[PDB]
Amino acid sequence: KLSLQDVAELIRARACQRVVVMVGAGISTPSGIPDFRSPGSGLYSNLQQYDLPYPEAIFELPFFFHNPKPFFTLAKELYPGNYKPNVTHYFLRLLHDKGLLLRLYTQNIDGLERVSGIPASKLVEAHGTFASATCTVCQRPFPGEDIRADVMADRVPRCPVCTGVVKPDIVFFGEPLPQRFLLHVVDFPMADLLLILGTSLEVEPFASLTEAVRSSVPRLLINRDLVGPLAWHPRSRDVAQLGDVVHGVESLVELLGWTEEMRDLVQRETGKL
Ligand SMILES: [Zn+2]
């Protein structure tokens, strides 16, 4: 058995230079990111004014092409700017800056990884991103920055060449995952540490990735509770810090002796923001 502290030591001793992180919704709740599926919110209330059989319909093509305006409501809401990364995000920013981060697989679409300062090439956004868009009609690619004004103005972005709808590269139901997902073939075998923050590991094939790391490689789950493959097939080098994600992360930063540096990075970074 290893403890959180033992993992911290591997990092401190420089024995973990190729960390692979998987993270889910649990890291973005702190930043106040609303759940579109959860009642009681401002965003949930918004979508309720449209004719939708359930909230998940905004992620279905047939609905989109019937009426795109529901989706673009969620888009406006989640578009970069509205929200600020949290300590969880900057922690991953730190790992990058110490040359310790091999890759960061995320299932969020809120973009808070890009904002906290992590480079597209270190990221694999498994659910897609608002940081770019495709024309539905002619297949043309565009910077998210470009449909920005239309999305904040409640207008349906339209392609300049053919004037079709320009859609953020989010993944809808039935859609194949982004191309970058296939980086897992080379990232997981090569990982010396696997870190899993704030995800309940139900959605496949995301969950099954935790089974791609070598048995000699520790797997650390920081999360509300023990979940999926980590729960059903345990491994001897598995460590769980069960509890509040933010709390658990501050503990690791502590055990790593990164307190000072984290406190700082968080003040440059949200300063600017
Ligand atoms: Zn077009």
Short mmCIF file of C-alpha atoms and ligand atoms in Angstrom, two decimals:
data_model
loop_
_atom_site.label_atom_id
_atom_site.label_comp_id
_atom_site.label_asym_id
_atom_site.label_seq_id
_atom_site.Cartn_x
_atom_site.Cartn_y
_atom_site.Cartn_z
CA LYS A 1 0.00 0.00 0.00
CA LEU A 2 1.09 3.55 -0.75
CA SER A 3 -0.24 6.67 0.89
CA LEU A 4 -0.87 10.09 -0.61
CA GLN A 5 2.49 11.02 1.08
CA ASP A 6 4.33 8.21 -0.68
CA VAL A 7 3.09 9.46 -4.07
CA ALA A 8 4.10 12.97 -3.11
CA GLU A 9 7.55 11.53 -2.48
CA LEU A 10 7.83 9.93 -5.86
CA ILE A 11 7.21 13.37 -7.40
CA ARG A 12 9.64 15.11 -5.02
CA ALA A 13 12.31 12.47 -5.74
CA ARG A 14 11.80 13.22 -9.46
CA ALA A 15 10.63 9.63 -10.10
CA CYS A 16 7.46 10.94 -11.85
CA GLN A 17 8.21 13.03 -14.92
CA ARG A 18 5.48 11.72 -17.17
CA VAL A 19 2.16 12.27 -15.37
CA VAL A 20 -1.12 11.68 -17.06
CA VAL A 21 -4.18 13.32 -15.57
CA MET A 22 -7.86 12.50 -16.18
CA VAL A 23 -10.36 14.99 -14.79
CA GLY A 24 -14.13 15.45 -14.81
CA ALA A 25 -16.90 17.73 -13.58
CA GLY A 26 -15.71 17.56 -9.99
CA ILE A 27 -12.90 20.02 -10.64
CA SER A 28 -15.07 22.74 -12.15
CA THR A 29 -17.89 22.89 -9.58
CA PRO A 30 -15.66 25.02 -7.35
CA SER A 31 -15.38 27.62 -10.13
CA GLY A 32 -19.18 27.77 -10.07
CA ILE A 33 -19.76 25.99 -13.39
CA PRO A 34 -23.53 25.23 -13.63
CA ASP A 35 -24.89 21.82 -14.43
CA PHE A 36 -27.16 22.11 -17.46
CA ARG A 37 -28.88 18.88 -16.37
CA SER A 38 -29.35 19.98 -12.79
CA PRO A 39 -32.52 21.80 -11.71
CA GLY A 40 -32.40 24.89 -9.59
CA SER A 41 -29.86 26.79 -11.71
CA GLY A 42 -29.95 29.76 -14.07
CA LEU A 43 -28.93 27.69 -17.08
CA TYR A 44 -31.39 24.89 -16.36
CA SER A 45 -34.09 27.55 -16.17
CA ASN A 46 -33.06 29.01 -19.48
CA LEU A 47 -33.26 25.84 -21.49
CA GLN A 48 -36.65 25.19 -19.97
CA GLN A 49 -38.24 27.83 -22.14
CA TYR A 50 -37.55 25.88 -25.28
CA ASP A 51 -39.46 22.89 -26.60
CA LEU A 52 -37.05 20.11 -25.48
CA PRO A 53 -38.14 16.63 -24.40
CA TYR A 54 -35.15 16.65 -21.93
CA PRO A 55 -31.99 18.74 -21.38
CA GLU A 56 -29.74 16.21 -23.12
CA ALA A 57 -31.45 17.01 -26.42
CA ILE A 58 -29.22 20.06 -26.87
CA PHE A 59 -26.39 17.54 -27.66
CA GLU A 60 -28.29 15.74 -30.41
CA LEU A 61 -27.76 16.71 -34.08
CA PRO A 62 -31.41 16.24 -35.14
CA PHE A 63 -32.46 18.78 -32.46
CA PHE A 64 -29.64 21.13 -33.39
CA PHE A 65 -30.72 21.33 -37.02
CA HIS A 66 -34.35 21.60 -35.99
CA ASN A 67 -33.44 24.53 -33.74
CA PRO A 68 -29.88 25.46 -32.80
CA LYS A 69 -30.80 28.11 -30.29
CA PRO A 70 -31.04 25.88 -27.23
CA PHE A 71 -27.41 24.73 -27.70
CA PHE A 72 -26.13 28.26 -28.28
CA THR A 73 -27.71 29.24 -25.03
CA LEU A 74 -25.48 26.76 -23.24
CA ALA A 75 -22.63 27.99 -25.45
CA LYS A 76 -23.02 31.60 -24.50
CA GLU A 77 -23.06 30.49 -20.88
CA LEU A 78 -19.89 28.35 -20.98
CA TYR A 79 -17.87 30.45 -23.43
CA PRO A 80 -14.41 31.48 -22.30
CA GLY A 81 -14.55 34.57 -20.12
CA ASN A 82 -17.56 33.75 -17.98
CA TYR A 83 -15.60 31.64 -15.53
CA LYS A 84 -12.26 31.48 -13.83
CA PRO A 85 -10.08 28.38 -13.26
CA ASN A 86 -9.66 27.20 -9.65
CA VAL A 87 -6.75 25.90 -7.51
CA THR A 88 -7.42 22.50 -8.97
CA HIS A 89 -6.80 23.95 -12.42
CA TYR A 90 -3.73 25.92 -11.47
CA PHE A 91 -2.31 22.87 -9.77
CA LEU A 92 -2.30 21.14 -13.14
CA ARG A 93 -0.80 24.33 -14.50
CA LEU A 94 2.01 23.92 -11.99
CA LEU A 95 2.71 20.31 -13.07
CA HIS A 96 3.01 21.59 -16.61
CA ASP A 97 5.42 24.34 -15.61
CA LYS A 98 7.63 21.86 -13.77
CA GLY A 99 7.90 19.76 -16.89
CA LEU A 100 6.02 16.98 -15.13
CA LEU A 101 2.85 16.71 -17.21
CA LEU A 102 2.78 14.27 -20.12
CA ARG A 103 -0.90 14.93 -20.97
CA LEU A 104 -4.24 16.00 -19.52
CA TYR A 105 -7.40 14.17 -20.64
CA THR A 106 -10.51 16.12 -19.78
CA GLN A 107 -14.20 15.50 -20.17
CA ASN A 108 -15.24 19.05 -19.41
CA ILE A 109 -16.13 21.50 -22.20
CA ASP A 110 -15.74 24.60 -20.04
CA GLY A 111 -12.26 25.34 -21.22
CA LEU A 112 -10.84 26.14 -17.80
CA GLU A 113 -7.75 24.12 -18.61
CA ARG A 114 -6.83 26.31 -21.56
CA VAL A 115 -7.50 29.42 -19.48
CA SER A 116 -5.38 28.33 -16.51
CA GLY A 117 -2.52 28.38 -18.99
CA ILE A 118 -2.13 24.82 -20.25
CA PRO A 119 -1.17 24.50 -23.97
CA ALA A 120 -3.51 22.82 -26.41
CA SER A 121 -0.80 20.18 -27.19
CA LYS A 122 -0.78 18.96 -23.58
CA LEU A 123 -4.63 18.64 -23.70
CA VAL A 124 -6.96 16.08 -25.08
CA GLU A 125 -10.59 17.34 -24.71
CA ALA A 126 -12.62 14.18 -25.05
CA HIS A 127 -15.95 15.99 -25.34
CA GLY A 128 -14.71 18.73 -27.66
CA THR A 129 -14.09 22.43 -27.14
CA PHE A 130 -15.52 25.92 -27.63
CA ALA A 131 -12.06 27.10 -28.64
CA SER A 132 -12.84 26.27 -32.27
CA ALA A 133 -15.80 25.72 -34.63
CA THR A 134 -16.74 23.99 -37.88
CA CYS A 135 -19.12 25.07 -40.58
CA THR A 136 -21.87 22.42 -40.76
CA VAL A 137 -22.25 22.86 -44.47
CA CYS A 138 -18.86 23.35 -46.07
CA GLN A 139 -16.65 21.85 -43.38
CA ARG A 140 -14.56 25.00 -42.88
CA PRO A 141 -12.66 25.50 -39.56
CA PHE A 142 -12.76 28.65 -37.47
CA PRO A 143 -11.36 29.99 -34.22
CA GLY A 144 -13.97 30.12 -31.48
CA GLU A 145 -12.89 33.71 -31.14
CA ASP A 146 -14.65 34.31 -34.48
CA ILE A 147 -18.20 33.37 -33.64
CA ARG A 148 -17.76 34.96 -30.26
CA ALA A 149 -19.69 38.14 -31.01
CA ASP A 150 -22.66 36.30 -32.53
CA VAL A 151 -22.87 33.88 -29.59
CA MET A 152 -22.75 36.64 -26.97
CA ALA A 153 -25.31 38.56 -29.01
CA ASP A 154 -27.80 35.68 -29.17
CA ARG A 155 -27.25 35.33 -32.91
CA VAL A 156 -26.68 32.07 -34.75
CA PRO A 157 -23.14 32.22 -36.19
CA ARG A 158 -23.10 31.76 -39.99
CA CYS A 159 -20.35 30.69 -42.34
CA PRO A 160 -18.97 33.51 -44.49
CA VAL A 161 -18.34 31.31 -47.55
CA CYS A 162 -21.69 29.47 -47.67
CA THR A 163 -23.60 30.99 -44.77
CA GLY A 164 -24.35 27.69 -43.03
CA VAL A 165 -24.38 27.36 -39.24
CA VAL A 166 -20.96 27.54 -37.60
CA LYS A 167 -20.92 25.07 -34.73
CA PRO A 168 -18.42 24.87 -31.84
CA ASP A 169 -16.47 21.60 -32.04
CA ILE A 170 -18.36 19.99 -29.18
CA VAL A 171 -19.22 16.31 -29.51
CA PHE A 172 -22.88 15.42 -29.88
CA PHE A 173 -24.44 11.99 -29.30
CA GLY A 174 -23.45 9.41 -31.85
CA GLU A 175 -20.51 11.57 -32.81
CA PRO A 176 -17.03 9.97 -32.88
CA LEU A 177 -14.59 11.42 -30.25
CA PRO A 178 -12.01 13.96 -31.28
CA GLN A 179 -9.00 12.73 -33.22
CA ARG A 180 -6.70 13.60 -30.32
CA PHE A 181 -8.35 10.95 -28.18
CA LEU A 182 -6.15 8.31 -29.95
CA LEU A 183 -3.13 9.83 -28.17
CA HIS A 184 -4.07 7.46 -25.32
CA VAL A 185 -2.29 4.63 -27.22
CA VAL A 186 1.04 6.30 -26.57
CA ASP A 187 0.37 8.33 -23.41
CA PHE A 188 -0.86 5.65 -21.00
CA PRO A 189 1.91 3.03 -21.61
CA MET A 190 4.39 5.85 -21.14
CA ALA A 191 2.93 7.32 -17.89
CA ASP A 192 4.83 7.01 -14.60
CA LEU A 193 1.87 8.43 -12.67
CA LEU A 194 -1.87 8.50 -13.30
CA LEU A 195 -3.86 11.15 -11.56
CA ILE A 196 -7.67 11.20 -11.52
CA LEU A 197 -9.51 14.23 -10.18
CA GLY A 198 -13.24 14.81 -9.85
CA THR A 199 -14.72 12.23 -12.16
CA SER A 200 -17.20 9.37 -11.50
CA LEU A 201 -15.77 7.36 -14.36
CA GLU A 202 -19.00 6.09 -15.87
CA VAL A 203 -18.85 7.43 -19.41
CA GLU A 204 -16.87 5.14 -21.69
CA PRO A 205 -14.51 4.78 -23.22
CA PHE A 206 -13.08 7.37 -20.80
CA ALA A 207 -13.35 5.18 -17.69
CA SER A 208 -11.56 2.19 -19.28
CA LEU A 209 -8.43 4.35 -19.74
CA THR A 210 -7.54 3.98 -16.07
CA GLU A 211 -6.85 0.36 -17.06
CA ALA A 212 -4.27 1.31 -19.66
CA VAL A 213 -1.52 2.26 -17.21
CA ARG A 214 1.21 -0.24 -16.30
CA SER A 215 0.80 -2.24 -13.08
CA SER A 216 4.01 -0.80 -11.80
CA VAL A 217 2.44 2.70 -12.14
CA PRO A 218 0.58 4.19 -9.16
CA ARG A 219 -2.96 5.49 -9.77
CA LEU A 220 -4.24 8.27 -7.60
CA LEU A 221 -7.88 9.15 -7.33
CA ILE A 222 -8.83 12.46 -5.77
CA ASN A 223 -12.60 12.44 -5.74
CA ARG A 224 -15.77 12.37 -3.70
CA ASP A 225 -15.66 8.58 -3.53
CA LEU A 226 -14.23 5.30 -4.96
CA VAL A 227 -15.56 4.77 -8.47
CA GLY A 228 -15.58 2.57 -11.56
CA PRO A 229 -12.56 0.40 -12.46
CA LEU A 230 -10.54 1.74 -9.52
CA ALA A 231 -13.28 0.32 -7.34
CA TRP A 232 -14.00 -2.89 -9.22
CA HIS A 233 -10.45 -3.88 -10.11
CA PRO A 234 -8.15 -2.50 -7.48
CA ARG A 235 -4.46 -2.49 -7.92
CA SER A 236 -1.83 -2.67 -5.25
CA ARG A 237 -0.36 0.78 -6.04
CA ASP A 238 -3.74 2.52 -6.04
CA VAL A 239 -4.29 5.47 -3.72
CA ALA A 240 -7.56 7.23 -3.05
CA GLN A 241 -7.88 10.58 -1.23
CA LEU A 242 -11.65 10.47 -0.82
CA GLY A 243 -13.28 13.79 -0.04
CA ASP A 244 -13.64 17.30 -1.37
CA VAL A 245 -11.48 17.64 -4.53
CA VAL A 246 -10.14 21.09 -3.61
CA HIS A 247 -9.26 19.89 -0.06
CA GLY A 248 -7.57 16.76 -1.35
CA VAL A 249 -5.52 18.75 -3.86
CA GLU A 250 -4.36 21.28 -1.27
CA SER A 251 -3.16 18.30 0.77
CA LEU A 252 -1.11 16.96 -2.10
CA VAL A 253 0.36 20.45 -2.74
CA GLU A 254 1.25 20.47 0.92
CA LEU A 255 2.83 17.00 0.91
CA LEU A 256 4.73 18.05 -2.21
CA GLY A 257 5.92 21.20 -0.42
CA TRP A 258 4.45 23.40 -3.14
CA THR A 259 2.32 25.67 -0.86
CA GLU A 260 4.32 28.88 -1.50
CA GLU A 261 4.50 28.42 -5.22
CA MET A 262 0.82 27.56 -5.58
CA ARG A 263 -0.30 30.48 -3.49
CA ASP A 264 1.72 32.66 -5.87
CA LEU A 265 0.69 31.22 -9.22
CA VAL A 266 -2.93 31.67 -8.12
CA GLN A 267 -2.43 35.37 -7.72
CA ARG A 268 -0.56 36.28 -10.87
CA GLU A 269 -3.07 34.18 -12.77
CA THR A 270 -6.45 35.32 -11.47
CA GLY A 271 -4.95 38.81 -11.22
CA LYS A 272 -4.81 39.07 -15.03
CA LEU A 273 -8.21 37.30 -15.36
ZN ZN B 1 -19.45 27.00 -45.08
#
